[PDB]
Amino acid sequence: ATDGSHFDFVIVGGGTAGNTVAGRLAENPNVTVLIVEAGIGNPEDIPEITTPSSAMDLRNSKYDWAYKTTMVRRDDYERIEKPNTRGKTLGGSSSLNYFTWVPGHKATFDQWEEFGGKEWTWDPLVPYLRKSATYHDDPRLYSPELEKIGGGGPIPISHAELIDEMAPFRENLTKAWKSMGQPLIENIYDGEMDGLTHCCDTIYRGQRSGSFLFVKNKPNITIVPEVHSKRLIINEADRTCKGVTVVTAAGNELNFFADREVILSQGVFETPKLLMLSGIGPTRELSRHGINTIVDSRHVGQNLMDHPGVPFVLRVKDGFGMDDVLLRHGPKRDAVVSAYNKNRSGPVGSGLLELVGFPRIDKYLEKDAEYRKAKAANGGKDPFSPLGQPHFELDFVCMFGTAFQWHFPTPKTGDHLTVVVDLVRPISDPGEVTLNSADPFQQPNINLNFFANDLDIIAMREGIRFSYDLLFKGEGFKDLVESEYPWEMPLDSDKEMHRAVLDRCQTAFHPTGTARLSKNIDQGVVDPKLKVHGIKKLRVADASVIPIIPDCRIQNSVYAVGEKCADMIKAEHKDLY
Amino acid sequence: ATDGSHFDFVIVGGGTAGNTVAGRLAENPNVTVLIVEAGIGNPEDIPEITTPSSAMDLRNSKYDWAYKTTMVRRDDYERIEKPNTRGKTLGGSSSLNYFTWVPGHKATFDQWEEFGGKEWTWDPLVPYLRKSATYHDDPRLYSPELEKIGGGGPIPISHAELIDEMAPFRENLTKAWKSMGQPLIENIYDGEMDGLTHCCDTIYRGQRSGSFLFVKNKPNITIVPEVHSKRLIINEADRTCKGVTVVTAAGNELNFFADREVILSQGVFETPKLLMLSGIGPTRELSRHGINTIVDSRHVGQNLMDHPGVPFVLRVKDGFGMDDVLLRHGPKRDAVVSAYNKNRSGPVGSGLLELVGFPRIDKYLEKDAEYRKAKAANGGKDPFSPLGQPHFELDFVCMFGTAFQWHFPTPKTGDHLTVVVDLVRPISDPGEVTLNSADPFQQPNINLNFFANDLDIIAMREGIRFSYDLLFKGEGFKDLVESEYPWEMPLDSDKEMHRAVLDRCQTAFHPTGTARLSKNIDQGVVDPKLKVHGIKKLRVADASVIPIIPDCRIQNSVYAVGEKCADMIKAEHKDLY
């Protein structure tokens, strides 16, 4: 693209919501759309991106921002980690994520009303939760009712394409789950999600479905990859966003201008950073780094909320995990790799997560004197999920997963199960994203503030206990477990579990909130139309907009945000739509 | 003590060097000495303090500052830890340390000349390295020449009082060491230290020898424990230190004044902090926290240097470690505990470290292409120890040691060996101590900057390899090893070892340098008489003074610093001494 070029719409950050907004705005072939993006422009050409079983290997790769971030910062404990993985590539984090497609609980989205008014509640959002996807059920295994989860969008989704060898595993896990007295559930798309379900995925015919699928073969979209944002171009007199400044690989600064609107989609971490570098954020924090304040927006970078996860690995009987096929070199791996290469069939095309659980654990919580007291102190309402929401998402990954074992080596032998214990309704206060300096090439500082509240530790402990009961005592599955890796979970000691949770937890990869939808600038950074409070012609569409984190893996809500954003922009520009 | 009281000398921080200086100045019964100290005043009354086998249990106890500190801060990796243990109690860190008494290499102390001139070199310092100690050899096991290591001081020291059951262990380790072609050595007190030695300790008749032994039964010493320093009292016009302000348990601020001199002994972390709070430090760093600059002293808090350590545990054959006697509850433990209680005999009185190795590893280093290139680039001189110094201190702790395994649980069964691989001559740049704020009750911020230079990683890797060779291949000992805890050291992969070293390393507990001796304020913070550049009547005596870290565990050099400081103060006040 030529320096100083004008486009109707500029999307800053070709990520998950970014491409969604861009592709929708481009549906009028006459509307000019520019996308600027730090990463490569041709993800579909990269096997590790398109191949679902390679996902975890994308951590630390060239497609990963690989941020340092503080996971917990309590007086008794603090840990900082790297990499806190985020996608750096067209498609953003939808190009390196773990595929699960799940919206969340109706009661939770209904509470968005406090921030976004009625249009940001469950029912009105349902269509936006479905618009991006085209649902498939080729093997005809699931209720035809479930076809309503795809509205016709360019992101192919399907229930996991089941691995044949894992059928015995699925059957035992199912038996175990029911033996605990917990429900099976298939429809988790209408606001209810209690039980063990067969998850859907952004995978189809063993290929990844990334947001880059929104923006190809559209000649009205100009895609400029490999450029790093320096600053939003803001006219102070007009209080207007004019466009964006970027730096090329050769180190040249380029300005691009939007004739209608700029949409900021740089994700939960970089969106608030670029706002601040552009003069929009907490005034004391700007001054501290030599940045003028154009709009004193206190909430920018604040309210960072994520799900803490404590994963744990069990060694399981031979043939009940995929380690020997996918993880280790050999003829077995060679075979499935050769099949995948010829027609994309086989387990190489698998995302390795097929059964997912959304339980409550009231009866475990009730056994803890402290939880009992906190609940009473809250007038008898459950602190975590007072509206019937799950307490956990339990992901049963059917092999050792490096992405969920940041400090333990990969075992050399044996098949494994990796259970991701994801606290989906935490009550710890949010963390924050702050500036390290005014340098656009430095990562912002990131504190997730996991487990600031002790109750969260107690719940996480109890969700590990629930998972252990299920797997060590559950019908069928109890016979599959061989050992705990890399040592025993100290479930016998509240004291030890306290240390175990803090020291072993990680991000579940769902950060949100840093430029949240709101009714005014004293509550959040963007209004219900996702316009930046205080600025004209500037909107944010990405996970930073999310005012209350969904009860599950969040990519579905992020696409929803992009779909709604595009709709709201179209409604505004009558002459174009 | 009464508010506003005057004393000839005020020691701020009743720690290792602190008490040394105080006790020596008090040798003229007419000189009044005050000691202020944050911790308790009666350590000799605390079993866990006086009992050498309890040392490791003092981590996280009430006697531990338990600082958060950043261990490594590289672009590819960063870890922050808690607790970074320091003594909070009369005697300071000499009240919770692991006893080893070893001075270091002559060539290294000779290089102090660049900072302190001739009087801070090996020969002149020898007497100061010996003054604090009274050497014992009751069982008459060692050369009578070695009695020269005790000059008659109030700190009883002895070669480790050997545990009988560990004799077979010592004998096998010795055989293994010699089988590798490395020397045995007993005299490591005259500047030479190449080999495996029987270490001496600040233990005698199974009681800890702490610096509090310097300051009891001296009625001219006023001891005020349980008070937290707020600030040094500095007269700007006179450029003079007048005394110190402290806060009591009840929250009252008290001023105490020195008629001759104030000696700051708050240790490597708190000494630079209090200087800064008092207006002495880097001016930009003071202003940033609202503190006036009285003296722009750039080096304050800078030059923090410590030894990185990568410990590792081996499970060893039954009866070749002390786990079953000291670590686990039972009749065995009951028996030795009952003996200790009646007459202080038995392994309960042991510091658990009896053999210590000081090897070079030139031939391991030479195998690494990068080391070879770096050495050539340094004109053919070894980067680490170009003057013949050791590369490592290898501590062979004869049981599982929690103090050296910060992220692994304590094994439930088996006897263990804990090998502390201490890189004693690192070449990474120093870290820093900075202010978090002007609040005297907040810990300063601490970055140790371990492994900033890749060569250090290569050496640490190779010192682990040397240790593994010794123990897995060495004569006698090879037959004792049962397994690696908690998994295998990835010695087969330079790549994995790189991650292993960074992720498993810790402080070896020897921080230094943050107010270093120097010839002028452009080089350091105190002059050769340990006077603070720019200020009269103010000296620093503690580990922050140390300009080049010794080649080993450092408590001996710290007492040396205190002994010299006291001598230099006495020489100045003729009318009193």
Ligand SMILES: Cc1cc2nc3c(=O)[nH]c(=O)nc-3n(C[C@H](O)[C@H](O)[C@H](O)COP(=O)(O)OP(=O)(O)OC[C@H]3O[C@@H](n4cnc5c(N)ncnc54)[C@H](O)[C@@H]3O)c2cc1C=O
């Ligand atoms: C491991 C991983 C695994 C998970 N797994 C599951 C999953 O299983 N399913 C689930 O639903 N969610 C999961 N998630 C969340 C899910 O993947 C969602 O994608 C996120 O929750 C929300 O997607 P945004 O639209 O809010 O943010 P985005 O980062 O996508 O797009 C931002 C774009 O901007 C560019 N960009 C940024 N800065 C600059 C700059 N300075 N100059 C120029 N360009 C810049 C940057 O390169 C990128 O292209 C997962 C995420 C991670 C990993 O991040």
Ligand SMILES: Cc1cc2nc3c(=O)[nH]c(=O)nc-3n(C[C@H](O)[C@H](O)[C@H](O)COP(=O)(O)OP(=O)(O)OC[C@H]3O[C@@H](n4cnc5c(N)ncnc54)[C@H](O)[C@@H]3O)c2cc1C=O
């Ligand atoms: C685990 C541990 C184990 C090791 N093991 C071996 C060992 O085996 N042998 C060895 O030679 N060295 C080892 N070392 C180092 C060795 O122990 C040495 O002691 C150190 O290397 C050097 O000793 P300072 O004189 O330089 O510093 P100090 O902290 O002693 O005294 C400071 C005093 O000031 C007080 N004080 C501080 N702040 C305030 C305040 N605000 N307001 C009021 N008071 C305040 C504070 O409470 C304390 O009393 C080891 C240390 C640690 C642990 O710290």
